[PDB]
Amino acid sequence: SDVFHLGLTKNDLQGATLAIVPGDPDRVEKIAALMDKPVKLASHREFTTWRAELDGKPVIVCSTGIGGPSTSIAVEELAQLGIRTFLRIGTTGAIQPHINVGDVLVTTASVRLDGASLHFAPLEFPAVADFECTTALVEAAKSIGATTHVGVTASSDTFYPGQERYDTYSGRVVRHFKGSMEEWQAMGVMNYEMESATLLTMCASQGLRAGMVAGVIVNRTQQEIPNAETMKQTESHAVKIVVEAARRLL
Amino acid sequence: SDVFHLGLTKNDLQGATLAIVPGDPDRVEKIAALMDKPVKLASHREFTTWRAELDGKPVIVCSTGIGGPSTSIAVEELAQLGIRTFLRIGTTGAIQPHINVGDVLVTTASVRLDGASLHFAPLEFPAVADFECTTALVEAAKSIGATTHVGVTASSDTFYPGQERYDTYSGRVVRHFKGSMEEWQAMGVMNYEMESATLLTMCASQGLRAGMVAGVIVNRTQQEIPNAETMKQTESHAVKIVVEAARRLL
Amino acid sequence: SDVFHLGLTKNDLQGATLAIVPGDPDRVEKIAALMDKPVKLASHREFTTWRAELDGKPVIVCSTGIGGPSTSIAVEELAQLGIRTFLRIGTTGAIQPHINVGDVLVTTASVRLDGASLHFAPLEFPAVADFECTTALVEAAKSIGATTHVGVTASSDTFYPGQERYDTYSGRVVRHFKGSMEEWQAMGVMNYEMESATLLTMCASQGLRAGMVAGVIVNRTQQEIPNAETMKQTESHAVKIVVEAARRLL
Amino acid sequence: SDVFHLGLTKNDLQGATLAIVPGDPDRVEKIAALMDKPVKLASHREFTTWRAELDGKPVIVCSTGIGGPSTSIAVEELAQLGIRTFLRIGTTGAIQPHINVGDVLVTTASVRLDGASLHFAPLEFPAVADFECTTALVEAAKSIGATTHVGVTASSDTFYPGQERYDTYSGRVVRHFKGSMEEWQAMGVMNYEMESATLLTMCASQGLRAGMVAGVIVNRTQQEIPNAETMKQTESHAVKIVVEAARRLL
Amino acid sequence: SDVFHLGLTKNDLQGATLAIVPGDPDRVEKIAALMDKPVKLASHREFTTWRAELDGKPVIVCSTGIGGPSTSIAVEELAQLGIRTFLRIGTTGAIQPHINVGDVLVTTASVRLDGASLHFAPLEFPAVADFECTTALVEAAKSIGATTHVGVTASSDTFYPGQERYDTYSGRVVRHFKGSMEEWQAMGVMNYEMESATLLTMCASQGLRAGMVAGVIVNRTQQEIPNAETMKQTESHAVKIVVEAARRLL
Amino acid sequence: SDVFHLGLTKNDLQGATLAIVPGDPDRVEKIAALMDKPVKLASHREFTTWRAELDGKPVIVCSTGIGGPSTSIAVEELAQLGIRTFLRIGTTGAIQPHINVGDVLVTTASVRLDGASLHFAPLEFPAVADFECTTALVEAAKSIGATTHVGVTASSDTFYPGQERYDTYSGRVVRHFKGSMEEWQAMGVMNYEMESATLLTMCASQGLRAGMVAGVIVNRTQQEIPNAETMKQTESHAVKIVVEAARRLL
Ligand SMILES: O=P(O)(O)O[C@H]1O[C@H](CO)[C@@H](O)[C@H]1O
Ligand SMILES: O=P(O)(O)O[C@H]1O[C@H](CO)[C@@H](O)[C@H]1O
Ligand SMILES: O=P(O)(O)O[C@H]1O[C@H](CO)[C@@H](O)[C@H]1O
Ligand SMILES: O=P(O)(O)O[C@H]1O[C@H](CO)[C@@H](O)[C@H]1O
Ligand SMILES: O=P(O)(O)O[C@H]1O[C@H](CO)[C@@H](O)[C@H]1O
Ligand SMILES: O=P(O)(O)O[C@H]1O[C@H](CO)[C@@H](O)[C@H]1O
Ligand SMILES: O=c1cc[nH]c(=O)[nH]1
Ligand SMILES: O=c1cc[nH]c(=O)[nH]1
Ligand SMILES: O=c1cc[nH]c(=O)[nH]1
Ligand SMILES: O=c1cc[nH]c(=O)[nH]1
Ligand SMILES: O=c1cc[nH]c(=O)[nH]1
Ligand SMILES: O=c1cc[nH]c(=O)[nH]1
Ligand SMILES: [K+]
Ligand SMILES: [K+]
Ligand SMILES: [K+]
């Protein structure tokens, strides 16, 4: 292996320069399966990597795991191997009433509620997505007619308090985050996720291109019993979109 | 007057919902002159406002003056009058060797080296531009074949120390900003300006659309002796681009 | 021109070392008119400069425009031209019940709710006024028997949220400033303005003397329909005071 | 499943109240294998969970994945299931010359270079380990005669810049972390890891007991070429020590 | 004198390497009186120093006065004289209902609500106690059967607002500390004191060992008329404990 | 006693409303001795209090001890007893070449390098002295012809690192303070002391008047070997000046 965690060699990528990075290792195969000649390259810790072919060009799919820390490792090591474009496809919880479960959200920039982004640039630096990737993702979503929303995303190092959830063990939320969701809502923030802040910041400040898209599997403002079928259908929609976006970025 | 500083009334705008906001009062007439039926509406403090017609639609041009403070007043009061889209057109100093004087820069997001943006959202919130406005500005630039660069901009509350200039009275730069330009350069920041951080943040967090474009009148990394001719020629192309962008946002 | 923005040359000042710096360009002539041989030197952007004579000594009057950013430019460039003493005369909104519209407030130091001051010294540095200037302003006010208050001023980069105004477009105030006015009131802060923090900090940390005086045109704690005549009368009072203070600083 | 990510139910734990939480999913089975009746309960994302019996008491082993984010999810959900004591066992890079590869380090408290801990308590709160767990870990290490060091650990949201590594793609380290390792060294910090800050803080501030132990697989101050043999042998001893510590905490 | 404030010479300590540091000068003699051959060495400002013998070894007792500032001076100068181990014995106000007046609290680490600790290490560094000292203090308390609590302590630079007391002259508490006590309580913090944050941080980051123990003289959650006799009895208990702990650290 | 630490009752002050607060308990008697009918009221911890008569009016002299913490206790409790004006008289180390040992420094405002001031107002609030007290101190100094300097003072919670001293046990200074003295010097800061930031801030934000004066006993920029004679002679003149200032504040 040429890198410390991914268990991959430069040769494994066969010259690939673009990688699709889902948060869940389980989603990696599903994404690769949409492309040609999918092959599993490795699996270590939360990092599962597959290689596939898109329009004759080798493409990488590598899970980041949950959070900026593992994400920073995956991006850095993939970059060490030649990857220059990263497209994240994940799941998210919307916080706006007009956004529905099943909708696809494209992040223009993220509210930095993470710690890793700070290891690449001070807080004042914007966790903004690459313009070409965002455009490709937007066009891709439009190509299949998906209900899409484009805007700001709150990226939290936490699934519970940072996203102001009280249905927890302690049932408390530290002062800094009390009433934080309502604030983000008033500011027009579309959703909560846990890797975009780190991904976009580290890429934007290091000459790497990054895009971010996620399917809504829950809406914090509208109570409704989760539909597993709907979730699977949503993830499928987003996956088709991230792959189609990758085609435009080759 | 219906607002505290601009000396304007709701009717003066005749239903206008988009405003072009240059930093210099002197540039307002030049911008309006490119459109139809240009009329001067008011002039108070650093706020000079003209109204014009673009493709049959009333449009506003209002100077913000230098800095987020005066900018925040202009944006807020214009918003109080119905304006929902703001396109800033200004001048800027590039800090990348590959960017030349005369080039046009479109800001995707800004490094917040200002204080006003904090009066609308905490530092972690991204000073990101609206996707539609950015796109319009990019297309507009392409329409006339202008050499264009799209990326991050460092927006400073200061023209001198915040932009790490030492050719000053004290000849010193506070510790926080010592070696700051080199850092931004390494992070791929394209330029320094003084209003985008405030403009983009306050708009992005209040449901208002904002775009940002500026012409390069100097390159901090290139010796070169300033030329008024090309400097005014650069302002010209930028003005045309912001107007053409506005057409696509009507 | 020897400076980048003011459009002034060293020779224009005829050796002047003191400048009166109002926020509004329109007030510059009114101030100069009180002195001898008033002459307009230049007018660019929000920077309008006049020269006059006080007790046989050349004196400068230069508008800073609204906000620390434009203020920092004006002060720096005037300093580049030889100015060593700066006296700001502005308008302000009082936040104490015992202070009345028409009263004159002399700032001893300011609460730094700006961003520019940070470009000269870290937040812990006090935005304190020069002792000689403050004294001169206090004596000057007493010379004409004006009702005067001496104390701390909250200097905001914003006219609306930073001064906790809710009568706005969004009708919201970012968390950091929610309930901030009541806090300042409890701390004895006299008023809100938008340039003293930047002015005092940059001067105090660079060997330049600065004083700050403003006339009350509104009291946030006492509702009362604004009287234009009263405002004009107040500005006149403050202007006479800043000029008289300048005489004692020659 | 009774929790959102772990894919576990309350009954799966059979009343277990203590969990051993390694960072790597692969290490979970190795840890459980040292105890009685080891059974795999689930595997989802980076969360692999096994149940085993220690001195007749049910015990849980659950991987956290790399980073405070995934760690915060695992701890919270395990707590939702009844777990009240958490013992982390991991790998680490020493930064002190007197510490050797193979040595075992017990963390008394951690330098918070993470973002998740802030989602539970402000920075001033100490990321301190529970006294009983620390004691148990120390005794456990002594029981097998392992060379042990007790002290402070720097817990980073990043494997590269936060640990001031320059052998990277960008080859640069953000200003905040430039010369940071030397500073920690001078302060007596023993090592760098990536989960203790989050683990200790969230536990200490929510009435949960937490301990932290790790085996040294590299020493940043000593040249030496990595050895898989001793690296796996080190993991072995650490695993035994954390299990033995758990026995004393039942 | 070999130091600037303590008025002590290296020779005065007769090779002592451990010092007991109470906050009150008046308590110094009481502590020394429990040991052999107690002798007063000096008294300057709030620094009163006595020397005594414990199991044949010379030991120092030196008051720090109230607060991290005076504490930092005492520790530094004593260290300059050879002291390497510091055990603080003080008084404290408990904030947990289950803790009673008369109980003894051993601090594992402290919430840094002080300013001095920052002069030795950034806020992210833990104000953790030395493991050996904490252990000795715990054992010592157990040796005489004192009701003991081990945990986190909130160390404030202030006796009133920082400990959220409203029974004051202003009757107000700055925003940062409003509702702060309830937050600490929810986080399991045991008590409020005013020197541990500074003591533990400066020692932990400079290779010096420090322990912290205090007797409860009030419980903020349980109203009860103070008993002077009880207080004297409590201080006596804690003193006997700190001395006994010192014996185990020789 | 009517207060928790000072061991004083309301009646002890006989209606006094002004207090002189030196840092050293030993200096209290010296100050009182200059006035009429001096009487010792109490002595507890570092708080020594005397009462005296100045021009027929009862005046209080109370030591604060070293540091904002003990200072905040003394000021608060004295305020609880009726004191409304506080004049600090201390010793200080100058950092400007033009200031000589023996000179007297009057503080207009202080750089807040303390933690206690934050317990009364956020960092942006200025630690400014009352205008009347400052004036009185300045006039008082002039009345006896003392070489006086008026300006900003750096008030540190620490005598060593915060004042960037390297002649210490560790011989190191935390990053935050490395090169800090040179920075303050360039900003025109006159000296280093340890109580003004806390004193001025808590007074200015609570409607209490405060003044600050200190005698130079060392100049960090000038070699010179310390002299007890001139050091005590300097304390003498400063004490007289603070007393004379008090007369003008009655
Ligand atoms: O489904 P992924 O891609 O993991 O993305 C979302 O899912 C996780 C939270 O359940 C976090 O990673 C969040 O960003
Ligand atoms: O030319 P404008 O539009 O003013 O923009 C630039 O010019 C000014 C500095 O000279 C600042 O306003 C900066 O943002
Ligand atoms: O009237 P000037 O001098 O501009 O001062 C006040 O007026 C403006 C706000 O209306 C800000 O500049 C504020 O400081
Ligand atoms: O081996 P684990 O337990 O994962 O611990 C260490 O290993 C990872 C870095 O390689 C991070 O998780 C770090 O904390
Ligand atoms: O009794 P000491 O040891 O002084 O400790 C406590 O007592 C003082 C407050 O009354 C502060 O020093 C606090 O830490
Ligand atoms: O001599 P005092 O009044 O104590 O003032 C100075 O002396 C002490 C330092 O030696 C600190 O209190 C400092 O402020
Ligand atoms: O609510 C949610 C759902 C998925 N992922 C998140 O980060 N948050
Ligand atoms: O260098 C420059 C030029 C124009 N505008 C800026 O803000 N900076
Ligand atoms: O309320 C007011 C009035 C004038 N100027 C300000 O800054 N605020
Ligand atoms: O150097 C290292 C090795 C293991 N784990 C870390 O966090 N850092
Ligand atoms: O309540 C209290 C009592 C003693 N010491 C403190 O710091 N606080
Ligand atoms: O150098 C010095 C001397 C006296 N007091 C201080 O705070 N510093
Ligand atoms: K302006
Ligand atoms: K992970
Ligand atoms: K003290």
Notes on the protein architecture:
Six copies of one chain form a homohexamer. The first copy, chain A, has helices at residues 25-32, 68-80, 131-143, 180-186, 196-204, 228-249, and strands spanning 18-20, 36-44, 47-54, 57-62, 85-94, 104-113, 127-128, 148-156, 191-193, 209-219. The first copy, chain A, has 250 residues and is of the alpha/beta class. Chain A has a single domain, classed as 3-Layer(aba) Sandwich (Rossmann fold), CATH 3.40.50.1580. In chain A, strands 5-9-8-6-10 form a five-stranded mixed β-barrel. The longest helix of chain A has 22 residues, at 228-249. The two termini of chain A are 26 Å apart. Chains in contact: A-B, A-C, A-D, A-E, B-C, B-D, B-F, C-E, C-F, D-E, D-F, E-F. Chain B binds chain F through residues 170, 172, 174-175, and chain F through 179, 183, 186. Bound molecules: 1-O-phosphono-alpha-D-ribofuranose (6 copies), uracil (URA) (6 copies) and potassium ion (K) (3 copies). One 1-O-phosphono-alpha-D-ribofuranose (R1P) is lined by residues 22-24, 66, 90-91, 159, 193-195 of chain D. One potassium ion (K) sits between chains A (46, 65-67, 70) and D (46, 65-67, 70). It is classed as transferase.
